[PDB]
């Protein structure tokens, strides 16, 4: 039973992920050529999103903040892992018990869906099964950990969790917010994945404070991600994965070299041109650093460039991946803020270009200063046309994502789906076990975000029920009322947050609070989105938690403490673009 002991869920993720790609793609093709199908895809997409979690525990690849986990000894590192499993097991069991009761009640009173007509107890079997699988995978890893740690450690880990959860039941009533934030910080600091840290924080408040009936959690979990716009996350992630691993990044890098290889520092100008070209393919920063940093960094060092400068320019140059569409943070914002994704995408183009121009100019200045130079080659119209022809598959995707959205032809999630379908086609017919493994990786990666959004929706709901967005809004207005003085305060706050928190985690936590106040003083909701994303993209390359630095440092085996100094000038040039977009809303929103 080894195949079921390890790879039980993976076949379903592969089967489901392919389905929603085909279902949504077929829905789109017939729609354009010229309705119940969306209901089916949304039900399946919920199935893979929660089935894929059990995998993410056995791989132990859950996204989390490990700023102090790394600092802790090995012994304390193990204790942190047993605590994470217990905490994540408390959440998994609770959503299991409520999910069963919810199904039992739904059986008593049947209730069918609009289009499919399925009883609602059928599509909700994801909650009991998936949190049923999740709970066992936790039990396996917990069993393995206790073998690794021992009897003394295990009781230390368990007793610590007992004291952690004791106050919730000891006291009949405790204030909602202190418990909500107090626990969210603890789980975040200890090492629990952010998505889970939110869920347990919300779950703890419901218990002690009774903000919502406990039965709401399961219903919120399924309903919070029952929307079509959110489906653009897995589609874009799949499209990037099937193409990032392809090796077309080398074809772009050759094209970027052709354009900008002649100028002094032309190599570092080629790197930035590549990341910008690959920014219109991948919707992530670290996907861009890894997909390009793997190639350019060893090449730059060999040509003579300092490795640290090669690591720096690649980290910052890759942050453009989230600016130029596609990009996850915009999709996370468009869903969490209920803003227009078709407008956020076009919003970030101009800030993305300005950041690239800013870096290219600085690179030109640095190279000319240090005497660095590019390669020698007789590039001409013949060679340029040859390079364009080679990267054609890479350059075809931006047409689909932009033409579909900007042109008003397709919804953002429809255009995302066509991209993944295209990624598969070029992911096999231009390059089975590897293809099977990639599909698991895309679904595993998407589920890392959707589960975060579901747990955030429960979190955001408890905050709204406590009028937190107004409590913050009144304090800010009273302190100052000027729109400019306000946008400065937000932009600073996000900068401090970006050095400590993940981009997507911060977006979902903060958008529920910041969105109203900035709207009161007349900031466009979309404009605040571009500010938020651009302000968090700079968070990729800001220590200690550099979401892009870590990838580049690994590809170069550098030292972050030393790589941080090299990239500091690059941060400043990005902050210049940040202020320009914030306080000159005309140009960043030229299209949007």
């Amino acid at each position, epitope marked *: 039973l080894g195949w079921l002991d390890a790879n039980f869920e993976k076949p379903f993720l592969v089967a489901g992920m392919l389905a929603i790609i085909f279902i949504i793609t077929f829905q789109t093709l017939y729609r354009y050529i010229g309705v119940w199908t969306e209901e089916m895809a949304r039900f399946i997409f919920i199935w893979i999103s929660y089935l894929a979690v059990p995998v993410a525990i056995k791989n132990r690849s859950s996204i989390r903040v490990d700023i102090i986990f790394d600092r802790l000894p090995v012994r304390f590192q193990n204790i942190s892992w047993i605590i994470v499993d217990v905490c994540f097991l408390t959440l998994a069991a609770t959503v299991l018990w409520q999910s069963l009761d919810l199904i039992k009640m739904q059986l008593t*009173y049947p209730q069918t869906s609009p289009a499919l007509q399925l009883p609602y107890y059928i599509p909700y079997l994801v909650l009991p099964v998936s949190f049923g699988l999740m709970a066992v995978r936790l039990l396996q890893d917990l069993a393995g950990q206790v073998r690794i740690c021992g009897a003394a450690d295990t009781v230390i880990g368990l007793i610590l969790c007992a004291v952690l959860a004791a106050p919730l039941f000891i006291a009949d009533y405790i204030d909602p917010l202190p418990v909500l934030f107090g626990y969210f910080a603890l789980f975040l600091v200890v090492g629990v994945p952010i998505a889970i840290g939110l869920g347990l924080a919300a779950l703890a408040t419901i218990v002690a404070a009774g903000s919502l009936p406990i039965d709401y959690v399961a*219903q919120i979990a399924f309903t919070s991600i029952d929307s079509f716009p959110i489906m653009a996350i897995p589609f874009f992630i799949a499209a990037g994965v099937f193409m990032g691993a392809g090796g077309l990044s080398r074809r772009l890098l050759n094209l970027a070299d052709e354009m900008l290889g002649a100028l002094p520092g032309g190599m570092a100008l080629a790197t930035i041109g590549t990341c910008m070209f690959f920014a219109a393919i991948s919707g992530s920063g670290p996907a861009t650093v890894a997909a390009i940093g793997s190639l350019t960094i060893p090449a730059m060092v060999e040509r003579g460039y300092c490795k640290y400068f090669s690591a720096a320019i690649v980290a910052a140059a890759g942050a453009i991946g989230v600016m130029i569409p596609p990009s996850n943070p915009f999709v996370v914002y468009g869903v969490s*803020a*209920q803003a227009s994704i078709g407008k956020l995408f076009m919003g970030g183009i101009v800030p993305g270009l300005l950041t690239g121009l800013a870096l290219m100019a600085y690179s030109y200045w640095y190279s000319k200063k240090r005497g660095w130079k590019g390669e020698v080659r007789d590039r001409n119209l013949k060679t340029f046309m040859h390079a364009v022809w080679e990267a054609k598959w890479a350059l075809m995707v931006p047409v689909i994502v932009l033409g579909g959205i900007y042109g008003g032809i397709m919804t953002p999630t429809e255009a995302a789906a066509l991209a993944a379908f295209y990624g598969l086609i070029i992911g096999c017919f231009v390059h089975c076990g590897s293809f099977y493994d990639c599909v698991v990786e895309a679904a595993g990666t998407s589920a890392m975000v959707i589960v975060l959004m579901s747990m955030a929706t429960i979190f*955001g709901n408890i905050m709204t029920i406590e009028e937190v967005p*107004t409590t913050i809004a009144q304090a800010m207005l009273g302190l100052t009322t000027d729109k400019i003085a306000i946008l400065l305060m937000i932009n600073v706050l996000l900068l401090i947050i970006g050095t400590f928190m993940e981009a997507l985690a911060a977006i979902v936590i903060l958008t529920p609070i910041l969105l*109203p106040i900035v709207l009161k003083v007349g900031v466009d909701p*979309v404009h605040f989105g571009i500010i938020m994303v651009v302000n968090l993209a700079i968070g990729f390359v800001t220590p200690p938690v550099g979401v892009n630095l870590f990838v580049a440092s690994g590809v170069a085996n550098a030292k972050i403490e030393q790589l941080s100094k090299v990239v500091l000038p690059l941060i400043a040039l990005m902050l210049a673009v940040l202020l320009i977009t914030t306080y000159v809303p005309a140009i960043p929103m030229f299209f949007a």
Partner: nanobody
Amino acid sequence: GGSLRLSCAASGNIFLWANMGWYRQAPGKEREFVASISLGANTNYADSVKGRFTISRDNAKNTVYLQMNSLKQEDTAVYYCAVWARYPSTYYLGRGYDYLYWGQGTQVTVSS
């Protein structure tokens, strides 16, 4: 056929509504759905209203506007200004429900 350019303003201790919308209850008919605008300015219209009525808002004054246009005798109903929160207030058997707060309404009569 001119435009009545309906405007509705909410008064209360609230800071700002997450959602706002319009419902029209024609005589001898049901309180149907006209239009709705999200906090981030996602506008959802009823099928008949698609492209005819534009809904906007002024977050500073806390006012929702329904720039009714190209009105016809097929549309002569009273109009109710509805506003509800960001998240559903109650859940029951795996569905989410909104508790809409309602305005008195303003007869919108159209002839020829």
